[PDB]
Structure 1
């Protein structure tokens, strides 16, 4: 485990909770440079905040980093409170982000988690209970909104 994992998941959960407060889906994340622990960006799901079909927590996080050179992505970790969907898996693959740390994969899991390993990326599931609890609360109280985010 990398020394910044605790920092990364803390920030990612902060983003998920902030997003929950604003009325949206409690999925957050951030991008951390593995060398020195700098936070390149952070964000949360913007489906309800901005009416966005594409701004998942992982995409929002990457957009909030701005355009980075390819070399930067190559030594980063992306932290996300929920297991990534097929789109966010593709983003991680496309940018070449070597490490993906997942809060939990209990309330949601896609084929992207294993496809990340197939494409050579390290996936870490921490099984964070704070993430599980906030995500389970949203699902339980707004289930119809929940199925829209995963395109069911």
Structure 2
């Protein structure tokens, strides 16, 4: 998919969220939801598995949760920014709400069939190959492999 004028802004917010969660002792993966028109931020968040003993609050899920209850149409013209290629669960959330565009920081440390499934389902996908993200996630995996495995049900 083509780039958008809000991509740089969206990925920066996501990385900051991932840095936040990192400081808090959790999995360094952040994200944010933004309106494709005015570039407003509907919400932002990061993985809360460790911060809340959560088995479902991945970075993408936490972000949607932080946006609060919304009318369906609201999701239809937004872009979900995530520092890491979405897992099947997070992919499903994007597809269910109809979020048409997903911008991914990197898919080197992790990638599920979800990235391709989104495209197959009529969703636009962009991989930025952000080195800050890749480097941060790379570190977490090497230093806490078992915690990472658990985050992806392995």
TM range (shorter): over 0.9
Write the distance in 2 (CA, Å) between the matches of 1:44 and 1:135: 13
Paired residue for 2:24? Answer: 22
Q: Alpha-carbon deviations, 1:1-25, whole Å to 9, x = none?
A: 1111000000000000000000000
Corresponding residue SS for 2:147: helix
Write the distance in 2 (CA, Å) between the matches of 1:146 and 1:63: 22
Give ranges in structure 1 of 5+ residues lacking alignment.
none
Corresponding residue SS for 2:82: strand
CA shift for structure 1 position 119: 0.3
TM-score of the superposition, structure 2-length normalised?
0.98
Write the distance in 1 (CA, Å) between the matches of 2:58 and 2:97: 16
Corresponding residue SS for 2:93: helix
Q: Alpha-carbon deviations, 1:83-131, whole Å to 9, x = none?
A: 0000000000000000000000000000000000000000000000000
TM-score of the superposition, structure 1-length normalised?
0.99
Q: Where in structure 1 do 4 or more consecutive aligned residues deviate above 6 Å?
A: none
CA RMSD after TM alignment: 0.4
CA shift for structure 1 position 63: 0.3
Alignment match of 1:84 (pick from 67, 83, 86): 86
Corresponding residue SS for 1:40: strand
CA shift for structure 1 position 70: 1.1
Write the distance in 2 (CA, Å) between the matches of 1:113 and 1:2: 19
CA shift for structure 1 position 58: 0.2
CA shift for structure 1 position 71: 1.0
